[PDB]
């Protein structure tokens, strides 16, 4: 049962770093891969939690620009896995009124990962109950640099004056400019850091650090974080 | 006495948000302005703490462009006060080998505040023991927007191609590109937020939220935060 909070104190936009999948599997003598598999159900449970509480925006850090520093085998697994999650869940997401918005760069992602993400976006683009910003091959600095590059192209083409480049001008060139600022930034684990996640958007966000590893995270932990947010 | 940490575990760059000045003065039945006055000595004690431990970069959020909680009178006082602090302390900073770097916008900030900041920069520009990034009329978003604007001007003048803009390109247009990433981000009080401070630079920073009101903050609290940092597991996505 979701907590009874006044509408004013419910976060419009919650961002979740889904960390500790590896560490969780080690503590249980399971392979790292099984932590990520367990993490899938955490995400769909948190999506249900957001739908029930009426949080209109959820951003999930699925795959960082910095995850390319992990082993070849773990990258191969994380690519295949994020693809298979989106394929297996897209019907449910469409049915529950979730609009999937892929944030990140195509970069060195497999074509099959880009295809699934692009199709999930197209399928769900008319949904309005919850916007899921699914961040795959995403970095906050990369997003800002891509915003400055796109702004630079408009300046070169003479669509924009360089003397009117302001914070509102740059904000228009973010991956999803219609998605508002992060109100609440949840770090599942004890790690107290942004890790390059929605950097521009999190400037004024409340940070809530829980000790729950992501595979043990569910709608109750999400509801707790929203309760902490409301009492602030 | 500063704690005995290996060089590898000493933060290269510490950033501090100096909050709780008001609440501290209220607990002692003094006006909020007097807590800011008391906060001055906290900052110089933390600067001594950084010098002793050998932290080469310190950034202090002295004055945010956005002061939305603050009364007009407290904002008027904090402008005059950040000016008077820098004027009164610049010789001591010069003597201790602290290089002052002003981060922020000229904007609505009084000419007298800009003058004192600019003179402190000129006086201390050859120092190398500690770089103090004194952030006055500063915002993280404002700095990134000013970087994009300066990049835009180079593109309009044809000094730069628009088609090859990367993270490293944009980073060259930050206020002080020679100052490295924040390793450790200290929020003095219990308030858990960045408050729009060194946003680009803090991407992979360790956050330490202490409960100390800023006027009670001194080198020992700074040393404690550095000790907490030395125990942190930094991964940068690896």
UniProtKB/Swiss-Prot annotation, chain B:
Co-factor requirement: Mg(2+)
Enzyme active site: 19, 67 (proton acceptor)
Keyword terms: Magnesium, Metal-binding, Transferase
One annotated GO molecular function: manganese ion binding
Binding site for substrate: 20-24, 32, 36, 64-66, 68, 70, 187, 193-195
EC number assigned by the record: 2.5.1.88
Residues that bind Mg(2+): 19, 206
GO terms of biological process kind: polyprenol biosynthetic process
Co-factor remark: Binds 2 magnesium ions per subunit.
Catalytic reactions on record: (2Z,6E)-farnesyl diphosphate + 10 isopentenyl diphosphate = di-trans,deca-cis-tridecaprenyl diphosphate + 10 diphosphate; (2Z,6E)-farnesyl diphosphate + 11 isopentenyl diphosphate = di-trans,undeca-cis-tetradecaprenyl diphosphate + 11 diphosphate; (2Z,6E)-farnesyl diphosphate + 9 isopentenyl diphosphate = di-trans,nona-cis-dodecaprenyl diphosphate + 9 diphosphate
Top EC group: transferase
GO cellular component, as recorded: cytosol; plasma membrane
Family assignment from sequence similarity: Belongs to the UPP synthase family.
Job of this protein: Catalyzes the synthesis of Z,E-mixed prenyl diphosphates by a condensation of isopentenyl diphosphate to an allylic diphosphate. It shows a large substrate specificity accepting dimethylallyl diphosphate (DMAPP), GPP, E,Efarnesyl diphosphate (FPP), E,E,E-geranylgeranyl diphosphate (GGPP), neryl diphosphate (Z-GPP), and (2Z,6E)-farnesyl diphosphate (Z,E-FPP) as allylic substrates. The enzyme exhibits the highest activity when Z,E-FPP is employed as an allylic substrate.
UniProt subunit comment: Homodimer.
Protein name: Trans,polycis-polyprenyl diphosphate synthase ((2Z,6E)-farnesyl diphosphate specific)
């Amino acid at each position: 049962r979701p907590p009874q909070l006044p509408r004013e104190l419910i976060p419009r936009h919650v961002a979740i770093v889904m960390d500790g999948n590896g560490r969780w599997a080690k503590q249980r003598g399971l392979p790292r891969t099984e932590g990520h598999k367990a993490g899938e159900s955490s995400l769909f449970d948190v999506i249900e939690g957001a739908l029930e509480l009426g949080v209109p925006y959820l951003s999930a850090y699925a795959f960082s620009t910095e995850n390319w520093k992990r082993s070849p085998d773990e990258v191969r697994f994380l690519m295949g896995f994020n693809r298979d999650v989106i394929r297996r869940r897209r019907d449910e997401l469409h049915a529950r009124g979730v609009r999937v918005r892929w944030a990140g760069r195509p970069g060195r992602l497999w074509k099959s990962v880009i295809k699934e993400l692009t199709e999930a976006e197209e399928l769900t683009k008319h949904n309005t109950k919850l916007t899921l910003q699914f961040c795959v091959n995403y970095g906050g600095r990369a997003e800002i640099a891509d915003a400055a590059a796109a702004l630079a192209r408009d300046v070169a083409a003479g669509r924009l004056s360089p003397n009117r480049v302001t914070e509102a001008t740059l904000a228009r060139y973010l991956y999803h400019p219609d998605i508002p600022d992060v109100d609440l930034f949840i770090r599942s684990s004890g790690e107290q850091r942004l890790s390059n996640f929605l950097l521009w958007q999190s400037s004024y966000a409340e940070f809530v650090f829980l000790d729950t590893l992501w595979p043990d995270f569910d709608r109750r932990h999400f509801w707790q974080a929203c309760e902490i947010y409301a009492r602030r």
